[PDB]
Structures are given as C-alpha cells and as structure tokens.
C-alpha cells in the first residue's frame, strides 16, 4: 500500500510542474545524481529547457582555478615551487583534489609546522590508486 | 583561443582567470618547435607575471622564476622589468616603483598592456600611501605629504583633485 | 672544529623520529639536547620545532620537574633573539611557577627581577595589564623594591621623564645581566627609552583634550622630528587616535565623537538627577522620627 503513496507525490508534482510557467519565479531548480530514474518524455525541454551537464574530464586551467583557493589557506613551503601541485593533476576532479589537501595537513601538523610540505601533498596524490586493478581486468578483458 | 581569453580578462582587471590563460599557452609553446615560439613565449612569461604584480603577492612570481628556463632561454629585458616592479611594489614605494620604471620606460612603451595596468598601479599604490597618511594629521603641509609617498609636489596635487 | 654546523644537524636528523623504545624521562632530555644545539647553529626556527615537539601537560608531573624547568630556560633564548619581548615574559612566568623556583629563596631572585623588565619591554597596550596584576599579587615580589620601583613607576598613570629614569636605574638594572647587562642586552637598555616615551604618550592622550605641541616636546624630552614620528606610529596600531597640525602650533589628541552620541548621553545624565530626588524623600521621613 505505501508505493501508492510515492506515486501521488510525484503525479501531484508533474502536473503543478507544467503549470508553474510564465511565473516570474525562477522554475523548480532540481538536482539529480543519476537520470535512469527520470522518466524523459514526461520530464522534458519546456519545463527545463536548460539542462546542466557537469564535465569530470576538466583541464589544466580549470584545476589551477582549484589550487589557488587551497594555497591562500596556508602559504606552501618553498621545498619546491607553487607550480609542482598542477602537473600531478592529469584529469582529475575537486573532489579528490580536496581529499588530498585533507591528508597532506594532517601530517603537517605531527612535524610542528604549519606549512604543509609538497612532499606530504606528494604521497597523498600517489596513493588512491586502488580502484579495481589491472590483474581482473587482463585476465579476460584484455 | 586560450591567450586572447586571457588578455580579455586580463583588462577586465581580474588576475586569477587570467593568469589561467596565460600559463595554459606558455606551456604549448614550450612543447612546439622553436621556429618562433620561443620569442611568444617571452613575451606570454612577462603577462602571467603582470597578472601576479597586481594581486601583489610576490611569493607567486618566485615560484614563476626558476632555473629551468625561465630565467635561461625566456630572459629578456621585459623579465627584469617585471620583478624589479613587483619588488617595489612589494615595498610598497610609489618612490622605487617611478625608479625601477624610468628607465623601463622602453618596456612600457613597446607594451601597450603593460603601460595600462602600470597606470593604474600608479593610482592602487598611491592609496594605500595615503589611508596611512591623513589618519594622524590634520591641516598637515603638502610638501610634508610629498616625502612620504617619495613624490613631486605638484605631482601630489594634481593626483588629489582627482581622488 | 668549525664543523660544528653539520654536527648539529646530523644529531637532530637522528632524534626528530618518534620512539617508543626510549623511557619518556629519556626521549625528553634527548630533545633539550638537541635545541641547545639548534641556538648555536642559529637557524631560531628549528629550535622552535623541537620545542613544539614535547608538551607543557606532561613535565608538570613532579618527576618531570626538572625537565620542565630547563624547558623554559631554552624557551627564553629562542624568544630574545628575535625581541619578542612579550613572548620572553610568558616563558619567565612559567619558570616561576615551577616549585623549586618559588621554594628557595635565592632561586627566585633573578627570576623576578627578569619578569620586571620584560613586562615593562612588551609594549603597554591592554594584554599587559590583565598579566601585571598577577605579577603584582605575589609576595615575593614585594620583598625586593629595586625592582617593584619600576614596575610600579610604569603602571601608575603618573608622568616620568627619560633622561632622569635612566640615572636612577643605570648602576643598578642596567649591570643586571641577560637582562640589559650583555652586550647585545645594551641595546634593550637603549630600546627601553622607545618604551617609556610611548607610554607618556599613552596617559597623555586621555587626559588633554588638547596639548600644545611645544609643551608636549619638553616633556618628552625629544627633539620634535622625533616626536612626530611616534605619534604617527601609536595612531596606526589604534590604542589612540589623534590629529597633529604641521606648522607645530598644536597637538590634538582625540577621537572624535557624533552630536547623535553626544545628545544620546545628554538623555542619561539627566535620568540620574531625577532618581536623586526621589531617594532622598523617603529617607527624609525616617530623619524627623530619628529626632
């Protein structure tokens, strides 16, 4: 009995939806992890003619964006240069780039210095790399 | 593509998207063939310093400055220009800023984007001399005000009037 | 050898890993070894690391005593290197602390005498006077008065002149040594005239409205070059805030206030006057019965 009343939530939401147009307030905002739940002709351009998509390929640019807010936080040691972060980076996105910074601090703090080492941020990159190996893979894939 | 976004911006007086653009190109040019490149890529190094005088954060032009190739092939007379600025700006001297920049004024005459933003750092500079300056005083002389900020005394007067 | 440079830092290399192995009486007393030998090195900035290393909360344990007391010793050299007045007083503090220091009689003396000129060193401000009233509490203090003539000279509002401190203390607190008594402590001798000056200035702005620059240069007792700086200096870091007029005719030190202030306060004074009356009434009727 309690599927039923998911549905009316959601029938009640697409027909108010339709009819929330040409209100000078912004249309329903809605975020989405995964769109296999939707169901895309009822949810559709008119209502929502502007669809985001959010790219995880990124650039050398985009990332550098990213370095700059983690280096103002605390001044990096001079062991070597701002520029070293950025070349490690090869693809990946802000959320691993925080996942980094977090460890590397952490570190920081055992040695007594405030400054986190590019050595420390070094090792916390190289690390993760888990993520199902090759081994698996190889056997009957490659 | 990348280096024009980067000059946009760059006038637009932001200096971290900027910057962003400008190493992106000098990267390229390093990696392409030394027909030309390595002639653009001086002149791409003295604008992602510029961008970086002007946020005055001078912890950024030394990690910029390196003896990979920066201060070997990349060295020019514009590059000595650029961090001789940013020190005397670090300095906070509107004094060694005109020193350093009388006799670049070659280098600021070949380049067009340089002598703008040199305009206004004149201005920026300026201010932050003069907040310090009218705190403590009031009814003080000109000629006073002139030795502070290291400028001409007419020079100092004209530059009220408009602030 | 002149190799010593490299000495120091091969031992430090060693000891910077934790170990367990080491007892804790050992692997502390093996860390104030190595910042000994980060102040002869002169790189300050090791010695502080090794400093951070160990904690305070540990030594307080009287087994550790001793090594909580030579703690505090090494903490001093580190902060008088870089004239870090306020931080040297801290550590001095602690020193006191210490059981043993307190106990015995000799072993306090040069200890407070120390704490004196280093509260009187750190700038006068607001930080000093939440700090000189515990060093005021302190009957140990109260026994000596070569020292107690300065502190308290410093901390009552009361107007002194430079030239004539500084002949009454020469013989005396000037040959005190690590205090003003080496020959790099000379010139923290010298420093203290910025000090006493700073904090005539400090009083003076409270009580004159207005002070004509002239007056205010004799009482100095500086030429009025120098004067004019220091003010401008006291202004910026915001304690006061004053306007100084440059043809030298006078010194204005206020911070000035809004007429909506001013009327706000006029509102009050006169809500006092009314209660005043009205007191005094009921107590009129107790008087007549009392006869």
Known sequence: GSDREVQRILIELLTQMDGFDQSTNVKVIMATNRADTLDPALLRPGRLDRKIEFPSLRDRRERRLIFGTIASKMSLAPEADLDSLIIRNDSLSGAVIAAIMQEAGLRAVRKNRYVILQSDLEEAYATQVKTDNTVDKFDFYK | ?163 | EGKIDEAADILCELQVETYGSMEMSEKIQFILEQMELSILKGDYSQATVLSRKILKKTFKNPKYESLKLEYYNLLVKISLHKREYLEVAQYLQEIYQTDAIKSDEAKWKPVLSHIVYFLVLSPYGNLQNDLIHKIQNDNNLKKLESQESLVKLFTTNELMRWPIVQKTYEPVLNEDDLAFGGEANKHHWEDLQKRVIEHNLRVISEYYSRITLLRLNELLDLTESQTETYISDLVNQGIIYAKVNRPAKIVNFEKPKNSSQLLNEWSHNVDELLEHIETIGHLITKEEIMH
């Open chain 2, 1 to 163: 593509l990348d280096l024009m976004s980067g000059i946009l911006h760059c006038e637009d007086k932001d200096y971290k998207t900027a910057f962003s653009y400008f190493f992106e190109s000098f990267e390229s040019y390093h990696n392409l063939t030394t027909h030309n490149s390595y002639e653009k890529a001086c002149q791409v190094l003295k604008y992602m310093l510029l961008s970086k005088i002007m946020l005055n954060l001078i912890d950024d032009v030394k990690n910029i400055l390196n003896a990979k190739y920066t201060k070997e092939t990349y060295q020019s007379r514009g590059i000595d220009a650029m961090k001789a600025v940013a020190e005397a700006y670090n300095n906070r001297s509107l004094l060694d800023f005109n020193t350093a920049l009388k006799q670049y004024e070659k280098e600021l005459m070949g380049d067009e984007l340089t002598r703008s933003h040199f305009n206004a750092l004149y201005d920026t500079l300026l201010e932050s001399n003069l907040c310090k300056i009218i705190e403590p005083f009031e009814c003080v002389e000109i000629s006073h005000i002139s030795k502070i900020i290291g400028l001409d005394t007419q020079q100092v007067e004209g530059k009220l009037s408009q602030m």
